[PDB]
Ligand SMILES: O=C(COP(=O)(O)O)N(O)CCCCOP(=O)(O)O
């Protein structure tokens with residue numbers, strides 16, 4: 141089923157306590173949502189589906205190109221499908237910068253607040269506010285207003301300090317903790333940047349420093365007069381694709397509960413489609429006067445292959461993040 | 470918007486009065502539903518989107534493989550999307566033989582009946598019962614029970630007499646009127662077999678006798694005491710793809726209000742994907758130790774081309790059926 145806010149909070153709480161994390165898989169369509177959930181279910185794991193602004197716009201179709209519509213349509217699809225699986229699936233929206241808040245996060249928050257006031261659950265269980273392109277103080281100020289709105293909709297806010305490419309400071313950690321607290325003001329996830337980069341590159345290109353995360357927890361713990369080993373932040377690891385298994389295990393140790401994967405699942409989806417087209421070249425194309433072969437230009441023939449391949453990569457992520465076999469069900 | 474039962478009846482009513490017909494486009498996913506509606510909108514036309522048993526199963530994902538779930542999920546997606554377009558889009562389910570009635574049409578009828586009993590609209594505006602593989606008497610006995618159930622849910626039932634390849638008799642037309650009436654017991658669409666075949670083949674292979682439909686109308690009019698130019702039947706034309714201009718135009722004069730298109734839109738969807746993979750072979754594949762090119766293995770890059778190409782084929786079908794520019798809006 142779709143994770144209720146209570147289940148989602150327990151998912152993240154148990155992951156934090158036990159040092160594992162959930163893959164958050166970017167999805168653009170019915171096929172990729174199906175692939176991601178089957179992946180979670182196959183791994184016996186709960187999981188996160190997320191829609192970027194570009195992904196939501198894509199999902200709304202070329203005739204609409206409206207993020208809210210695409211997000212809502214894909215969410216409504218997902219609510220029906222997820223009901224048929226025993227694992228818990230949370231819906232999340234991915235980076236929303238300042239100039240998109242009004243056209244994406246804020247109206248989605250409103251939709252959920254309306255559902256909640258009627259005694260139901262929010263459509264999405266978390267939304268990301270990405271303010272990494274403005275100064276930390278502006279970012280946190282916007283975060284504080286968004287947190288009030290999110291809390292009323294029973295939604296968890298994710299925020300970003302520092303930049304993801306295509307290294308957060310100790311003082312930034314303190315400001316954040318001073319502004320947002322440890323979650324009394326409502327639960328939030330923190331994407332702090334330790335060298336992470338969107339996309340997949342020749343390995344060794346991207347230099348991760350998970351120790352930045354360790355230091356952030358210590359500084360926050362000290363500010364809050366908590367245990368030295370306390371972990372006041374729930375971290376998010378952006379740019380998960382192409383990461384080393386040892387990088388991942390270290391980040392898990394420091395309180396990463398969510399790791400975003402997009403590029404590697406994109407490659408997994410597309411790879412068997414390219415393969416289908418090449419091996420079936422003379423059935424997918426009408427060649428030498430022939431009319432082609434319906435069985436192979438039927439989109440389901442190759443999209444089922446893409447789906448299965450993407451699921452298998454999701455199962456791999458569940459094992460990399462140690463959430464495999466951990467579904468709260 | 471999604472067509473309400475009343476505007477669907479009006480769409481079909483005006484199509485019949487004016488000798489035009491709607492494309493009924495088979496869709497399996499968010500991308501194809503988006504392509505189909507964008508096509509209708511581009512043509513200034515209302516339209517029908519349909520889910521086969523296979524399409525619905527695909528839509529539910531490999532981890533579910535359940536027809537009702539698939540149909541319902543795609544339908545909920547489509548309800549959100551269609552609301553953003555001025556044109557009317559009716560949702561239909563295709564081809565359900567006897568052994569699948571209990572797992573597809575009947576359960577879906579109940580879902581819609583529940584929505585209607587609470588004062589809402591049905592989730593689908595029509596469902597097809599395909600009894601072409603049973604004797605006509607058994608066909609019509611099952612149809613009578615379904616039609617009562619369909620009408621109660623404000624849903625149009627489509628039935629098939631005779632057979633779609635992969636030519637209806639005079640008395641079958643009379644039996645059909647005998648069993649189901651002319652719409653007083655609930656509206657239904659009639660797929661009568663005049664030589665239709667599913668799929669696209671070499672020209673001259675499929676030989677249609679559209680005059681069978683003229684004879685069906687004239688014969689039913691006589692048995693009903695109506696004027697000779699009455700058209701008691703609303704006909705559906707199966708095997709639309711790769712059909713000739715002059716047969717379609719002839720069929721439109723005889724009361725065809727719905728033409729199914731599947732194979733041609735599948736080819737249109739796939740063709741640019743194939744092209745993308747070939748021209749981009751060394752970006753969609755990780756070749757010679759390179760990591761590929763994310764901008765071309767991102768599924769959106771080729772799926773947007775697929776969707777646009779499908780929408781253009783849908784626009785063509787609207788032009789061929791003369792419903793282009795006719796949207797009730
Ligand atoms: O951190 C990640 C994923 O990183 P990865 O792609 O390295 O796995 N994400 O936040 C996903 C990136 C989304 C980018 O937006 P578009 O839809 O316009 O491409």
Ligand SMILES: O=C(COP(=O)(O)O)N(O)CCCCOP(=O)(O)O
Pocket residue numbers: 495521522523524563564666667668669706707708709710711729730731732733
């Ligand atoms: O009449 C038509 C279309 O005819 P066409 O394919 O010649 O355009 N249709 O009824 C659509 C074809 C049904 C598809 O069956 P599955 O997906 O369950 O395998």
Ligand code: NA
Pocket residue numbers: 190233234235268298400
């Ligand atoms: Na995110």
Ligand code: NA
Pocket residue numbers: 233234235236244245267268269
């Ligand atoms: Na967001």
Ligand code: NA
Pocket residue numbers: 337338339340378379380381382383403
């Ligand atoms: Na990455």
Ligand code: NA
Pocket residue numbers: 666667668669707708709710711712732
């Ligand atoms: Na055909």
Ligand SMILES: [Zn+2]
Pocket residue numbers: 235304338378379400
């Ligand atoms: Zn990111």
Ligand SMILES: [Zn+2]
Pocket residue numbers: 564633667707708729
């Ligand atoms: Zn058909």
